[PDB]
RNA sequence: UGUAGAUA
């Protein structure tokens, strides 16, 4: 390194200033303590002081966008720099988007830059992803970037991402990074576009609720979706209430079904299991005794009306001195009051 | 008694 920096790593300069590290901006930024020294002084800095530094981040900007320390520095400028340094940084970035989006460091920046630019540059920076949509949605770095777009970017500039997901919904609603994206779209995108998705979604409601993350997506719509889409799902559940509340994943979804259904639907779903006797005993006998099902049951009571709840507990008197036996049942006896 | 994304 240089002594200047060596002296900084040894604490030999207590009131070190920006001007005093001219010619060494870069080096500093690829060094943890110096990157950190700059990140701080940039916030409390004169316009002359920032530009000084800027001058030296520009010609090796890409290098610092990928450095493990150099990347917070570029990001500071997006936060606290001038409009012109922000567009200038954009410049730097044009036609480098895809690569930085997939890089461990570059995409943090990209993620920040996407947050601090007018729609014009925002709109521009995104189309560079066109035709590598699915490649980014399934990347470990790329995926927060796409998510970052769906959030920051005006929705009408992202039809290419709705298209890209066509007939792809299940593979992604059943993917690790794939399903967070699908949530964003349903949180941000226009009716025009959340229609094909919600459509494929319903195509595999039964399967998705059994997926590791697939359910998180059905779970999303139940909570946040339009009441027309809820009812369709709850309907997928109606009947299957027994076979799914014993599922490790599917239980979590019936849960939110009983929570987010119509008043009516809700009182029908609940009742379904208070009178669809299964085997030796009745329906909710198993649900009580089951490692996952009991939460579904405890939820039954939660959302219930005083009328239909009374009836539930009346069906749960015949086994009071029966649940003490099974421990998962034990968490139920502490409610019949 | 029960489930999910990347930096010093």
From Swiss-Prot:
Gene from which this protein is expressed: PUM1
Effect upon mutating residue 219 to E: Changes the specificity for RNA
Every PUM-HD domain range: 1-337
Subunit structure: Recruits the CCR4-POP2-NOT deadenylase leading to translational inhibition and mRNA degradation. In case of viral infection, interacts with DHX58. Interacts with TRIM71 (via NHL repeats) in an RNA-dependent manner.
Entry comment, domain topic: The pumilio repeats mediate the association with RNA by packing together to form a right-handed superhelix that approximates a half donut. RNA-binding occurs on the concave side of the surface. PUM1 is composed of 8 pumilio repeats of 36 residues; each repeat binds a single nucleotide in its RNA target. Residues at positions 12 and 16 of the pumilio repeat bind each RNA base via hydrogen bonding or van der Waals contacts with the Watson-Crick edge, while the amino acid at position 13 makes a stacking interaction.
Localization (cell): Cytoplasm; Cytoplasm, P-body; Cytoplasmic granule
Tissues showing expression: Expressed in brain, heart, kidney, muscle, intestine and stomach. Not expressed in cerebellum, corpus callosum, caudate nucleus, hippocampus, medulla oblongata and putamen. Expressed in all fetal tissues tested.
Protein name according to UniProt: Pumilio homolog 1
Region of interest called Uracil-nucleotide binding in RNA target, as start-end residue ranges on this chain: 71-75, 215-219, 294-298
Region named Adenine-nucleotide binding in RNA target: 35-39, 107-111, 179-183
Disulphide-bridged cysteine pairs: none
Chain positions covered by the region annotation Non-specific-nucleotide binding in RNA target: 143-147
Induction context: Strongly down-regulated in keratinocytes upon UVB irradiation.
Effect on the protein upon substituting residue 317 to W: In NEDMSF; likely pathogenic; results in reduced PUM1 protein levels and decreased post-transcriptional repression of E2F3 and ATXN1
């Amino acid at each position: 390194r240089s002594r200047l920096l060596e002296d900084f790593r040894n604490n030999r300069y207590p009131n070190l200033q920006l001007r005093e590290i001219a010619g060494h901006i870069m080096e500093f930024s690829q060094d943890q303590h110096g990157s950190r020294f700059i990140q701080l002084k940039l916030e409390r800095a004169t316009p002359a002081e920032r530009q000084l530094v800027f001058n030296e981040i520009l010609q090796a900007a890409y290098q610092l966008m990928v450095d493990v320390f150099g990347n917070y520095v570029i990001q500071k400028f997006f936060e606290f720099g001038s409009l012109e340094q922000k567009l200038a940084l954009a410049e730097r970035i044009r036609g480098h988007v895809l690569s930085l989006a997939l890089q461990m460091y570059g995409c943090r920046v990209i993620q920040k830059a996407l947050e601090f630019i007018p729609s014009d540059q925002q709109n521009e920076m995104v189309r560079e992803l066109d035709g590598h949509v699915l490649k980014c949605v399934k990347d470990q770095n790329g995926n927060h970037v796409v998510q970052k777009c769906i959030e920051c970017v005006q929705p009408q500039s992202l039809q290419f991402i709705i298209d890209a997901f066509k007939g792809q919904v299940f593979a992604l609603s059943t993917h690790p990074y794939g399903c967070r994206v699908i949530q964003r779209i349903l949180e941000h995108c226009l009716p025009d576009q959340t229609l094909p998705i919600l459509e494929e979604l319903h195509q595999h409601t039964e399967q998705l609720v059994q997926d590791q993350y697939g359910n998180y997506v059905i779970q999303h719509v139940l909570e946040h979706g339009r009441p027309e889409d809820k009812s369709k799902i709850v309907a997928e559940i109606r009947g299957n209430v027994l076979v799914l509340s014993q599922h490790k994943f599917a239980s979590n979804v019936v849960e939110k079904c009983v929570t987010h259904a119509s008043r009516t639907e809700r009182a029908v779903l609940i009742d379904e299991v208070c009178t669809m006797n299964d085997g030796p005993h009745s329906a909710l006998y198993t649900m009580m005794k089951d490692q996952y099902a009991n939460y579904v049951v405890q939820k039954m009571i939660d959302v219930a009306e005083p009328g239909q709840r009374k009836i539930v507990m009346h069906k749960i008197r015949p086994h009071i001195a029966t649940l003490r036996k099974y421990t998962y049942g034990k968490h139920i006896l502490a409610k019949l009051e």
